[PDB]
Amino acid sequence: MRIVPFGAAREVTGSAHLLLAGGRRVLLDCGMFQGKEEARNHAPFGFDPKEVDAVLLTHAHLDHVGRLPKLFREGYRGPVYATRATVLLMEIVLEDALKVMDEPFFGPEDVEEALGHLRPLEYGEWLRLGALSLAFGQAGHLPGSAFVVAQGEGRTLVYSGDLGNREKDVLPDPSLPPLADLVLAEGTYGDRPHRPYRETVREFLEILEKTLSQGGKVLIPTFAVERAQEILYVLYTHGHRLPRAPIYLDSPMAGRVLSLYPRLVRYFSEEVQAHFLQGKNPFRPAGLEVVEHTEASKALNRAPGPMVVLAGSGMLAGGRILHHLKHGLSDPRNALVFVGYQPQGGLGAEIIARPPAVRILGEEVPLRASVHTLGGFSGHAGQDELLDWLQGEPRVVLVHGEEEKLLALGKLLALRGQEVSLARFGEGVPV
Ligand SMILES: [Zn+2]
Numbered sequence: 001m002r003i004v005p006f007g008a009a010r011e012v013t014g015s016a017h018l019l020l021a022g023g024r025r026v027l028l029d030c031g032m033f034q035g036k037e038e039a040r041n042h043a044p045f046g047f048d049p050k051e052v053d054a055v056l057l058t059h060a061h062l063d064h065v066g067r068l069p070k071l072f073r074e075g076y077r078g079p080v081y082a083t084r085a086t087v088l089l090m091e092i093v094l095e096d097a098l099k100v101m102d103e104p105f106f107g108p109e110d111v112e113e114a115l116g117h118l119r120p121l122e123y124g125e126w127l128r129l130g131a132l133s134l135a136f137g138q139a140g141h142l143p144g145s146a147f148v149v150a151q152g153e154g155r156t157l158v159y160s161g162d163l164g165n166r167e168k169d170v171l172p173d174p175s176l177p178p179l180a181d182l183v184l185a186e187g188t189y190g191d192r193p194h195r196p197y198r199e200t201v202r203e204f205l206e207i208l209e210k211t212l213s214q215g216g217k218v219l220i221p222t223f224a225v226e227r228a229q230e231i232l233y234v235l236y237t238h239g240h241r242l243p244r245a246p247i248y249l250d251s252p253m254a255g256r257v258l259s260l261y262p263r264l265v266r267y268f269s270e271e272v273q274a275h276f277l278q279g280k281n282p283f284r285p286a287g288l289e290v291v292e293h294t295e296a297s298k299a300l301n302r303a304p305g306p307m308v309v310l311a312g313s314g315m316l317a318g319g320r321i322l323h324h325l326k327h328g329l330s331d332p333r334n335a336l337v338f339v340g341y342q343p344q345g346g347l348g349a350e351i352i353a354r355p356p357a358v359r360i361l362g363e364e365v366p367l368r369a370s371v372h373t374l375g376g377f378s379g380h381a382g383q384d385e386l387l388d389w390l391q392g393e394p395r396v397v398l399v400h401g402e403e404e405k406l407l408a409l410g411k412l413l414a415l416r417g418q419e420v421s422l423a424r425f426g427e428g429v430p431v
């Protein structure tokens with residue numbers, strides 16, 4: 001068989017990998033490009049959508065799944081397999097991008113068309129494409145996230161998909177992959193491990209007990225998919241020693257995603273499933289609110305008292321979070337907490353640098369609130385974890401991640417006796 005990198009090549013967005021084997025052609029993920037690499041969603045996949053036999057989707061994030069509708073707009077009518085959890089989130093994931101997105105490739109008819117071909121495939125459930133044999137394995141990066149195990153023609157291939165951070169408590173641990181002739185694996189964080197989870201939560205709680213006791217605000221830029229609810233989970237557990245204060249989840253989609261969590265209980269960790277059994281939703285702490293429109297959202301900019309805000313655009317420069325950042329942040333009683341590493345070159349990194357003042361929404365805002373950064377609350381497996389997962393696997397082709405980082409992981413794998421390479425766009429790899 002041969003697998004062909006059509007997406008996350010020396011870059012993190014665009015995940016799309018074509019598998020040519022068993023006299024068949026199956027697409028592994030079909031996501032969009034993001035940020036600066038936008039526009040390329042307008043270009044075409046170096047392959048023919050109409051010649052695809054079937055597509056398997058690992059998790060529902062926008063990369064990995066954002067171009068799928070484009071694949072249908074361009075002909076494809078075969079099935080698209082994913083787990084229920086991925087199927088359900090995906091509708092929210094797409095519908096949203098369809099709206100927010102400007103000069104949008106693909107459109108509404110495309111989304112239903114694409115959505116109409118989703119067929120449920122669960123962990124350890126084998127799909128057969130004539131001589132081809134595929135199964136999903138537990139990845140623990142999002143509810144319903146999987147890695148692909150592909151067997152056929154005496155060989156076995158494993159595409160990692162995004163691998164989760166096994167220290168956190170919400171999702172279940174990623175499973176080790178089976179011994180395979182070749183592994184297509186992600187390298188987001190191939191250059192470093194994350195700061196231990198326990199210490200991060202322990203610190204999170206200090207920043208909260210402080211800011212809140214002094215009547216301050218705790219702004220938390222976060223992603224609306226798994227990230228926000230996970231904070232909420234941290235806030236429910238532990239919410240017995242934290243000062244009473246409203247918890248505004250100022251993001252409709254984090255809302256929609258959250259609403260969906262109870263239908264997905266089987267997709268979470270044992271700890272989490274235990275709470276659900278005991279008739280409790282651990283993703284709704286003390287006084288959670290979920291704001292719906294901007295009037296209410298801006299009223300928060302002026303309201304005082306102790307408060308905790310979770311707002312859209314995790315990597316800043318985007319959502320309601322900026323208005324929250326504009327007012328407040330100029331006040332020392334507050335505290336900004338990043339629950340994801342910020343990309344350098346973008347605001348945030350610019351804020352971490354502690355410049356006396358920052359530019360937000362065309363204004364010059366005095367930076368006086370305390371700023372804290374908590375990688376550790378990361379959703380991807382870190383270097384040390386990527387290493388253990390890859391363990392004893394000959395041949396590894398690194399995809400999904402900035403060149404330098406991908407390489408850093410590569411170096412270590414290489415120094416260990418593993419054959420390593422960095423997938424190139426279009427250049428298929430064998431087996
Ligand atoms: Zn992901």
Ligand SMILES: [Zn+2]
Nearest residue numbers: 061063064162
């Ligand atoms: Zn990804």
